[model samples]
Target chain A: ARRLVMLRHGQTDYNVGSRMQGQLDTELSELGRTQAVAAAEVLGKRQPLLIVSSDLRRAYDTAVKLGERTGLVVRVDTRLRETHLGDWQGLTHAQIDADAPGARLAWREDATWAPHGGESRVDVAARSRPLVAELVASEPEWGGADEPDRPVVLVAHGGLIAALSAALLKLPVANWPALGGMGNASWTQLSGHWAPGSDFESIRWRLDVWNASA
Target chain B: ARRLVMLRHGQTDYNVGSRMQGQLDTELSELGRTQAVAAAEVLGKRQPLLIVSSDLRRAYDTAVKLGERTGLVVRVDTRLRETHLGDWQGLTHAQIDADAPGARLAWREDATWAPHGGESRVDVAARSRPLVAELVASEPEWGGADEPDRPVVLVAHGGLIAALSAALLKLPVANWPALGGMGNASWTQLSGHWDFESIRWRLDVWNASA
Candidate 1:
């Protein structure tokens, strides 16, 4: 079995301020740090084998919390980034609503909708899906042959996480809005029963735990 | 949020022995004690304000594990005991199978159905519901304002735990099968926002809260 845990980044001031942080590099807020500590207390008990995180500071710092507990160094990946919000980056929802009329709703409602100078919802999901596939195939050694040895952690943003979850669960690409957004520093776990030699098609991952803050 | 943590008692030899010691006052097996220690370690981190437990030794002893960690005394009550399994006491599934065919299936399939000389499923549910109501209403005072200070712990058996969970979440007594059973020393939780008055159901009921 391959244990894949999807961890959303802790809160940023942007998160509390209701600003779009699409691909913007910013540190976690105080509450976000508290959330990471709490989330770390939970994940520290589980002991993930490895960590992969978006280069963005919000996610990178969150992954570091787990890394400190498990003694695993954080590995950054540009591919794991949140959807590029382009012109709308660093702006609030109200500003986006006033400037790019329907862009926010279109982004939420339509996968094909891309903000000016940014990637579309479908594009982010497409890029995010391959990393998940790669993580599934990359067998990291831990111990024993009978049980799942590899526990890989992914620290990323809420939108991209919704994409990755949809990709694995066979939920449609644009269905993220309905799936709901994950809270700050919340841990969402996806698991499946698979041996080393088992084919990918033979495996079906289920969302055993989702958006668990503690 | 008003948080309630329902912790099932640690393993008895009956658990590993494939025997049903329903309403029987058995102590936790060595493994059960180890499981209790592990549960205590996990729960102690959460810092529950108070503790309530079934009077049976199995649950009472398990509750002591948490009490030792948090310095909170275990409060005992017989009403929290497992359903009275009358003639079915001290019997294994295989023995029950040989003695009374389809009794196990009927017990699982129908909540109204009772085992030989045992309480019906609905009877346990009725007895279980009001206790949870009492716990919810008796808000323990915790310091400060916004954050939840009260996290009450209830240590009991599987069936009674299931009934309490079902009752709180508003799942029907007949829906017991879907409510499912928890493992030894494992805890299930129910939570809600609380202040002065209104109690709005959050995340649904026993079937509702995971």
Candidate 2:
């Protein structure tokens, strides 16, 4: 079975302050560093073959801990970043509501509602879908028929992780909440039987674990 | 918010042999006992408010492990038992294939296909639905307000867990496979802001085998 381990980046100052952290290049907090080490301790046991991350500091640093432990190079893919919140990026939830009443709730309920100068959920899902296709096709030369396959880890943000999983599971954007938003420094494991050359849609992807924090 | 922790019973001899274990009352294997204790240790940390199990020994035994850890009494429900396989209950996969070629595949593809005298997926689903309703209604005195809410554990068979989760998630019988079968001693957790007074669609954690 092929495994996809989706990991959310650790805590940041923006996270603690309840600010929207979309596409902002912030560093991990002190506790977030501990969280990365803790998450790495758990995920490293699986000996992940690949470590892919959003090209952001918080996510890249989280991936680095796992890479350091597993001896795998940490690769960056900008498309795996968080949903670009644009003008609403640095504001708090209440502030967003103050500026544009019910804007936050509207974004959650409507997939097409892009923030002022930001990307929509549909836009995030569109960019995120190909990354999975690329990862599935780019199988490493480690495990084979006799040996157990190693997991491919993708350390990313909450919204991107949710969007990617929903797209792969063939779920429509409306049902995205069913998969729930992932917690910081948590892991979600998905397993499926996929022949290297098979259609991505043909694979019966099963979500084995979700929002599991160490 | 309310929680539903669906736990599959530990390994059994029937499970190892790959025989149809539907409705068969079998004891847990030696490893299954250890697995029960292991699962119990992990689950005990949550301090579950209730422990419900199928009357079958394998399932009941698994529930007892958690009960011993958390000091909660085991409540048995017959409807939580495995899907009744009828004539296919004791037969091995090869034997079943010889007797009724392509029947197993047909059952997986068809939700309404019952064995010679067995229950269909829909039948198992029907019997399992009320158990969740009953559990949700039977909330005991536990953490409230400022304290974190405790979870309710349902120790049951694979088919029942799959059916119950699918039903709670509002997925059709045909889409049950999307949830996948639970491994031995594994858990599937579902959470939702369910008012004790109302019924609503819940979010499922699907299946977690840690």
Candidate 3:
């Protein structure tokens, strides 16, 4: 069966403080770099076909380490970015709550609607789902990834990951909580059979691994 | 290079409650069963040649899931069991502290000794060291294992794994702290070239879970 390893980048100041980065484009902290090595030590064993990461610095750097260790190129996918939290970017949870009450819950519970002046999680899933499609359709010969035996490793933000997981399982926006929270540098696996004759739409993807870390 | 996936079992009551279960042989808790599934989801991707686990219920059951998922048989080794606790078996850290004031520190820092009446973590290393020698010396063979491309996995307890790594690195038994601690259900990969002719004993995978 074919699979994908979804990884969240290491810790950042925003992460440590429970702040929302919202595509702030920050670098990893020293602890974050160590977290990267910690992650690579394990993922390096899986030996993915190639790593596909969000072009953002935090996720990109994490993918670089995996690529260096596994001897695979790091491919960029902008659609994999964290949900863009417009006005709420760079704000801590308390700041967000103070600035906009109940907006976080709204965006979380109400899918199509985003926080005031923020990007929609629903829209994130819309973009995230097609990316999964692009992945499953491309075979090893395509030059971006390897054979079904090896998988496409996706590195991105926590928001994007949850959205991606939700999209793959065809879970409604309401059930987002089922995917659960992901820790920094943690990972999950989604796997299924992919072939010429199978119905891509009918194939129900399996969440083989979730929130796994060193 | 050949690698070993060193995995610890999921949460036990002793684990969540912060109690020491040194070789008590308790079955996994509900949380452990779920943790096992979560761990298998990712590891199944690696496709280990075969799995070897401690005969203890916790590690053995953890290996069972991997075997079921990967279509490989699970092998057992008693040496992989956790350090025997003896008199300290069911005692909590506080209880141990009251009974043996600084003995825990002595055993942790001094290789030759152990706490008042507990099993020697140092002696555990004696048994653990040779096992590493055997594993590192052995290589991908023609039968029993699928291929040399994957790895050999050993599902075991936190304590014994700590001993194995220290022995391989020759890290002073005193600095067992360097080995750090492993999380329940987490795993590490120790990679090295293994064959009848060569064994790179220098390979070290001291990480808690890789």
Candidate 4:
């Protein structure tokens, strides 16, 4: 069985202000650093084979701290990003509510809602599903029988985590939030077998932890 | 009447390493960001008219956060920086001790002892003193009022703060440490007058409110 772990980046200044950061880069808060360190302490004992993280500053910064603790270099991939909010980047929720309340309502009502020049839930899932599959398939440790039993940790954003969880569980894209908001610095666990005809029901998927700190 | 507030930038990874950062641009640590916020909260209440900070990343980052909190536009000045430490930019205390023990000892004992290619205390004082005096002297607020009322905030590095404190206190160059090591985000208030004559000292110097 191949075990996969997904972690969200820690709290940022944008998170504190309740802003939609999207691709906007901001440094981690002090509490965020504490959260990263705590996550590292918990995950380091697991001794994962490889650690992957989104190239975003907040995610990469957290991953670097974890890598330092775990003695593993972090591999960065750009595809594992938060659902792009495009032009709405850096605007607070209150600001968006005052200016684009209709779009906000649409977003709340349907997963297919796409803001101007932004992405929908479907768009996010499409990008993340393939990248995750590729990562799992290409990793040698998750392949041959002789490979080690070590886990692989993927540090990403909340939106990507939710989408990835839905894909792995074979849930409908519209029901994405059923997995819930993967809070800052949270982690979910998944296990799958490489053997042929591996039953989907046999796979173990669980929220081992959520919003651990920060 | 003109006021000048000298504050050190937030802490960094290099700070824990006990290395001379000089002009080496380093980002603040998580704790350093917190210190910056706290400094902002403390200084914003003081209501300084202008906020000036060093152009280096560490100082500029702190200034940006402080400006956000205080609703002031931070003016970045390259002249207000730490003495350049040259080749000793990133060496830890132990590393420096192992390699250049004699220079380290001299540096500790006297302000005249400069590291190889680094600025002497005299050089630092010369470079920073004029700009600081000019900043204080040129302010319109100082012209009509007595010495105690002028207020301005200048955010820079530890070395610059130390040098400025020495200048304000009228201390000999050898007694530079009398001003003490400027703590991260700490500000020292100087209440005095700046004139053609020597900058006159008043009731208190280096009064740290935050």
Ranking by DockQ: 2, 1, 3, 4
Cα-lDDT of candidate 2: 0.81
Candidate number achieving the greatest lDDT relative to the actual structure? 2
How well is each residue in B26-116 modelled by candidate 2, as lDDT tens digits? 9899989999999999988988988889999999999999999999999989988989999999899999999899888667656678998
In candidate 2, which residue ranges exceed 4 Å CA deviation?
A97-103, A109-112, A140-148, A194-197, B93-116, B140-148, B172-174, B194-199, B202-204
lDDT of 4 by residue, B87-143 (tens): 777887788889976677567446666788888766777787777667665766643
Fnat: each model in turn:
0.00, 0.36, 0.00, 0.00
Better of 1 and 2 by TM-score: 2
Candidate 4 achieves a global lDDT of: 0.70
Show pairs that collide, candidate 1: B169-B205, B169-B206, B205-B208
For model 1, residues A117-197, the per-residue Cα lDDT tens digits are: 898767787898787667656754522254464567899988787777656655444343434457788766666554456
Query: Candidate 3 on A1-214: residue-level lDDT in tens?
Result: 6677889999988788888898889999999988888888888987687689999999999889888889889999889898998888888889878877877766654557776577776778888778777766775442234454566789998878877776775655554543445778988776654344576676556555567677
Query: Model-by-model lDDT, in order?
Result: 0.73, 0.81, 0.72, 0.70
Q: lDDT per residue, candidate 4, A1-214, as tens digits? A: 6777778889999998989888777889999878888888787877887898999988998888789988999998888888898878888889899987767756843667777788877778778767666766577666336665577888989877766765665544544433335567767665555335454444434322223332
Interface RMSD of 1: 8.1
| lDDT per residue as tens, model 1, B1-210 | 677777888888667877788888888899888888888888888898888899999899889989999999888877789988878888899999899987885676477777878987677878866676676667545322654755778888878866665455454454445444566776766654433324422221121111
- Interface RMSD (Cα, Å) for model 4: 27.2
Clashing pairs in 2: none
- lDDT order, best first, reads 2, 1, 3, 4
- TM-score of each model's chain B: 0.87, 0.92, 0.84, 0.88
